[PDB]
């Protein structure tokens, strides 16, 4: 699994591969690891599919109820609910989650919640088995406030390298653009990103 | 540890050693392995010191409540069952105790109950409990008769603990003696093995093995 | 155990503490952890004491024979190669961790060997449980081009770092200086900062205190 | 019963004539991966106390919230919240110590090594340690993990016994600390070059220096080291 | 489990003024079971004495080995072996079994016939030589012995005094060890004569 | 897996005089081969002339002392500041410990004070509460080194009247506070020489009808 | 385990050895003689692992007999026992060690004295007034520690055993099916055919 | 293990139970009665884990006695045994199960017939002509399989036991110190005080 | 440990960090992982120090003897001796070795010999714990036949990222240039490569 979230000038973009596995078998090659917990607060799932789905499904429920009572929740708040669940249940979960959201006052924010249950706000974040192979690449290519075009490229390149080296990653590259303009889903096929 | 109690024509004899060991380390040579439940009840200790010493003290409390409640001294059988049933509640938890509940009541006469943390409860005339038990049994079994002068029985008991203290690495220190009659128990001193051995050796001609 | 090695402008010096242990008990309060392989090649050892001694004498013996055979002064690289290949042959089962130094026709040298057979080379080294305490000192005071005295201070200071901060180290400080031109000088108990205070009382017993069962003379003459 | 995941390394500290100093690098490791770099492991509670934490970072973040909550709580119905009845280092410690022990006693520890540094209301210097087992102790110098093995030996050379505290100035002390941090950067494979340092002086108050860096390192001799024994080039 | 804790027993040596002393208990048991109270653990070859604690079978074996070796040594060297030399022989003999050692705790005591200097040394099970100038302890009650010695001991004691001191160290240490005791014996060694005494101690 | 227990070393000692008693302990606290502190008090005055020390695992040791001190505080509340006799304290400590029989306070505790007759008293407990009154007792890391000594010098064991053919044991006279402090110091300086977890300092608390008094002596720091 | 007892009286050594041979759930024999004569005045009793027991005894026997023929002489009991210890001592560090314990009772026609040697599978040798292998010790060692004298007669000795065997039939958990007794003295080795009621 | 035997003859049930009580290395008692009377015509013998054994027996006893007082009637042997099985069956899935095996011998005053029930700690109940718990079976089941008749007299039955007890003293490894015999019939329960030579 | 070997226009360059560890302790910070087995055949060592040293020491011996009898050995031959040792003793070795050599007819060659004992000839190779973090970076920056300057840069950048993420790597970066011109040792300190 290869998942990342990059904050740029107009907001934030989430990216992921689409491969789910059980051993060496690809249980699903068109998986959607970019999950929606609110209008403009999404997450990237890595680790247990069962665990991350269950967690996401619950956060979504919490934010919906939160909205009913106190209006729109911040991206920070969403990261807080995830964290609360991942920390308090660290002994029975295997979920590496990235929370990305766009808000009118903060542009886009990115919170990475690793295996332990700690939270880390960052300019961008990478995770999943594939991420290890692109630590160098991403550190040498990320720039703050890139344009939507530059960001989509940075992600398409990073994930193609992750998909290239990590067997647990593959399929198509999926992206979700979160800006004031709305929500945009992007999809890139092998033939396109492989020869980058 | 070595503890023995036996019934004979003159009542009951109770003898114990006084050594405490933590592994092969000798923690103490002055431990009281006999708990005085009351003027007519005695309890011996074998196994874990804390376990015996604690629960047997607790037993004394339970006996005292019984007497206040029923206006009468508790029977040896009942005292031993209080301990037996308590210990059974903890079966499997790790308690370690080989115990002897000895007493004299008008209704029961001289009585001895063996109670261990296994949940085993037995009435008998002779019982040797502890790592030195076999040694004590060796001496005791082959010199025991129902007709022993309260003074001869006392010595047989003392001598049996002596045997154990000698052969058993975990037994030693001194010997504590008790005699039990319907009038109650009578303490017959603490005999340090340091002096007792040589005395017995010289006077009896036994332990002829050891170099003197 | 704390053992170190420090190079100086014209030689090399090695030092060590003198505590030997078995569990939390001090076996020897003043053993020597400095071993002579050849006159000008000494080795400081940590780990299994019997092993540091045996492997050290074995290579030393072979170095002696080699020296007589080749009619040349022993070289540190030889002690180093013979030791490491031996330790390696034994898959680390010989618990020896050594700092080998000395001077020979090619100059002054400082190396270290690990039980499994790997070797290092540098200007300052430390091994043993006090390893970290000593290294902190060295990392804080070593500089290139040190004088014989500077080096001895530094080495001696590093060992103390061990003696005081490491429970596995203690007692005295043993040093050995190997200067490119002169004879090697072994300084047994160079420092003795741990003398036992005068006991509060004498326990000399009044004669006759001990009870004796029997007596006799033993014949040692044949 | 757990096992740490994201972790912080050493936390070193010592006390000088007027206050105490404490420092810790800004790394949050993930095994051998030096994953996170802007991790502050020095938590100021009020401005007479600074809590340095090492170990599991998720647990650290948790202990951080506990501390902020303690500050909020102490303020409730407390007209002397920033006077006679403000939090003292000793209170913050005793609390943390209590929590730490209860947690290990329930077989679910907060996987951390903690050092509380500060100045008591009466000017006294406070410095005590507590870890995931609930163990505690004080000394003129204190360090967790790797720093206990390398930093202490150094720091103790400055303040070896009680009578050395009054003879040590903030300059001398801060120097020892900064040098220890360098040494740790040399030999701890889980250390970072960036770190924070804080001073708690009974006169100057709380000075919290962020974004420091190990400077003046000796690496030149590395060029003269070739091979591992017999190699010449 | 621990082979050196099957039979039990202790040995201890001490240096006095122009004299050396070495003592041992007499117990040989099997775990808790006491079996023999006549198991001396001190031996000698010429004027060199050797005490051995540990697994009984090895104690016996080593004695028979050192007798063999010291005898041949005398036949070839045409002189009795000295303390220092013997210590080396003991050390190399043990290390020769580095990866399958005898479970023993050897102690050497004697006076160099040529220098008249007192000598004592201890060894771990693979030969590590500990040559002390004051005392050497060995056996299942070595901790106790260290405590006794470190306090009771003082330099240059006269034979008659050294005897009190070594006997008290041994006696009180053994009384705190379930595996030691059952009688002790003490050797006081001087250039000219060697005296052997059996101590009176608890038999429990 | 998680191990809820640790070992901080330490060694304590308790000796009873005719009208006084003492409880001593080194001031070194450790973890493996590192020293946590060269001075971390281990023997405490709990009031009513009771001194106590629960040696072993510090977390547990502190918890126990704390719990006992609190027990004393309530004893006063419930019985009009009535003094808690030493024997009563002992029975109470037993219940505190046995209360955790199945998840023990990994400590060996000793307390000292005066009995109801003004005589010196020492009580020692095992991890789960087994206890007994004694004249002296060492507990902790070097207990195995100190006890034999105390058996000899305090209760005159294995000592006979010279010339009595070893038939008359040396009588049980009784040590003065001065003679006791000497044995204490020698016990620790001796322990300090052979046990790597003993050193840095010795703190002694002396109990008399006039209260609790402290004395402190340094011990080798290696 | 099996009962292996030995007691050295005035002018002889007496060996008693349980007769039962049990395998798991069934007692297969009640007349087993756990002994081997090494020489006319040297007898050895044994107990231990199923196969090694006899294999070792017969092996020792063969050697002692061979030495006798070659030297036309009978090795002293001490010498025989020393040989046996060496053999077990080697065994303990071999690939597959003999799990055998033995008692050696012999009459030294030279010193004209009876001797008893106890030796375990580790090569531990000790000479005693009386000895035993296995659990038997735990009962008898204090019986004899009590009722034992150096100058006892062979008759007194046999009575002392009767005392021991009784205690063993009383407190030992297993039914060892009684013992077979044998006496070694100046005249050699003989069996007390009447002990099943002596 | 302990010897627990039961044989149902013509008009009675006979229960034999070893008297020894051994703990590790020592036999602590040779007169232990491993039985409890549940009602005037129902007897239960037991063997198993040290504590559970009696705790369970006395527990069952208390209940059967309580039922008797409350109903002023004595439950049939079949009913008593069914109650006991239910109790053990529950135990087998409890936190700490009773490790006890039992034989229930009773005389059904209504049907006027003797009955023998075998029940293990798992709650396995079977009615048989004769039964046994532990190893005893391995010897006796074929002895009785051979010499057994439905119409045998109480006297013949006791002889059949004597046959069994002998075989057990011959082949069993342990010394169970003989048995205590008891007969349950139309007149109740009585003990055969003279079997130590009957 | 971070080690790599890159073949370029004029020959080949070997690079490595200088950190040796035992747990979290840096046993040596100035380690030389670039070992000489012949005039222009060197290797990069990763894994066990004891094992790789013993192996290298032996190969050196074999090539020296080979030279005495049949003149200069090829780079291929050197890789062959290493492989023979690593494969035949795979059960008792933990050595990941890279063999790089310069010869007048083949320019520079690079053979990577991974844990199994297999051999792989390549344009360039990376290995050691640090290598995982630069798979993407190196795949996106290596070009065949770069100039000595470009190559030294490529290596300095790659290894700085390796040293950055992998705790087992650090110290100085060492390089060895093998060309027709001879042998050149390069050394780069933290201050220089850290801020790249
Ligand atoms: C991202 C890959 C990873 O981050 N990690 C690798 C582990 C994969 C988890 C997830 N797939 C599954 O959980 C599949 N089930 C499964 O692996 N079961 C185990 C098994 O080995 O059979 C059992 C629990 C021992 C299945 C439910 C799809 C996965 O593919 N993770 C991806 C991404 C988050 C979907
Ligand atoms: C009788 C000897 C024996 O019958 N058995 C040998 C075991 C000895 C137990 C007792 N000594 C102790 O219990 C010591 N405390 C102890 O072991 N505590 C445990 C611990 O691990 O620390 C706790 C219970 C988990 C100590 C009090 C000496 C002993 O000596 N037994 C004697 C007799 C009954 C005193
Ligand atoms: C240096 C300290 C260390 O480097 N390491 C701590 C371990 C100590 C080793 C040595 N002492 C011994 O080796 C003792 N013997 C021993 O441990 N034997 C083993 C055993 O488990 O009994 C055998 C080899 C399996 C004893 C000889 C003191 C020691 O003190 N090391 C010092 C320094 C090198 C003397
Ligand atoms: C390259 C790092 C790695 O490739 N792999 C990590 C393992 C390190 C190996 C080598 N260091 C050592 O071997 C050190 N000894 C050692 O680790 N011993 C083990 C231990 O955990 O103590 C024992 C065998 C269980 C020491 C000999 C330096 C290392 O640092 N590798 C580097 C590079 C090749 C030097």
Describe this protein's structure.
- The PDB classes it as hydrolase.
- Keywords: alpha/beta sandwich, Cytoplasm, Hydrolase, Nucleus, Protease, Proteasome, Threonine protease, Ubl conjugation, Phosphoprotein, Zymogen.
- The entry is titled "yeast 20S proteasome:syringolin A-complex".
- The structure is cut from a larger assembly and holds 9 protein chains of 7 kinds.
- Chain C has helices at residues 49-70, 76-89, 131-141, 148-165, and strands at residues 3-8, 11-16, 20-22, 25-28, 34-38, 41-47, 96-104, 107-113, 119-121, 124-127, 173-179, 185-191, 212-217.
- Chain C is an alpha+beta fold and 222 residues long.
- Chain C has one domain: Glutamine Phosphoribosylpyrophosphate, subunit 1, domain 1, CATH 3.60.20.
- In chain C, the strands form 3 sheets. Chain C has a 5-stranded antiparallel sheet, covered by helices on one side. A 5-stranded antiparallel sheet of chain C has the order 5-6-7-8-9, with helices on one face.
- The longest helix of chain C is centred in the first third of the chain and has 22 residues, at 49-70.
- With 233 residues, chain D is of the alpha+beta class.
- Chain D is built from 4 helices and 13 strands.
- In chain D, strands 1, 6, 7, 8, 9 and 10 form a 6-stranded antiparallel sheet that branches. In chain D, strands 11-2-3-12-13 form a 5-stranded antiparallel sheet, with helices on one face. Chain D has a two-stranded antiparallel sheet with strand order 4-5.
- Chain D is globular and about 75 Å long.
- Chain F is built from 4 helices and 12 strands.
- In chain F, the strands form 3 sheets. Chain F has a 5-stranded antiparallel sheet with strand order 10-1-2-11-12. Chain F has a 5-stranded antiparallel sheet with strand order 5-6-7-8-9. A two-stranded antiparallel sheet of chain F has the order 3-4.
- In chain F, helix 3 (143-153) runs antiparallel to helix 4 (177-194).
- The longest helix of chain F has 21 residues, at 58-78.
- Helices cover 32% and strands 33% of the residues of chain G.
- Chain G has 4 helices and 12 strands.
- Chain G has helices at 52-71, 77-91, 137-146, 154-171; strands spanning 4-8, 12-18, 21-23, 26-29, 35-39, 42-48, 100-108, 113-119, 125-127, 130-133, 179-185, 188-191.
- In chain G, strand 7 (100-108) and strand 8 form a beta hairpin.
- In chain G, helix 3 crosses helix 4.
- The two termini of chain G are 24 Å apart.
- Classes of the chains: A alpha+beta (196), B alpha+beta (212), C alpha+beta (222), D alpha+beta (233), E alpha+beta (204), F alpha+beta (222), G alpha+beta (198).
- Chains C and E meet through strand 4, helix 1 and strand 13 of C and strand 9, helix 3, helix 4 and strand 12 of E.
- The structure holds ligand SRG (4 copies).
- One copy of the ligand */C1=C\C(=O)NCC/C=C/[C@H](NC(=O)[C@@H](NC(=O)N[C@H](C(=O)O)C(C)C)C(C)C)C(=O)N[C@H]1C(C)C sits between chains B (1, 20-22, 27, 31, 33, 45-50, 52, 130-131, 170) and F (126-128, 130).
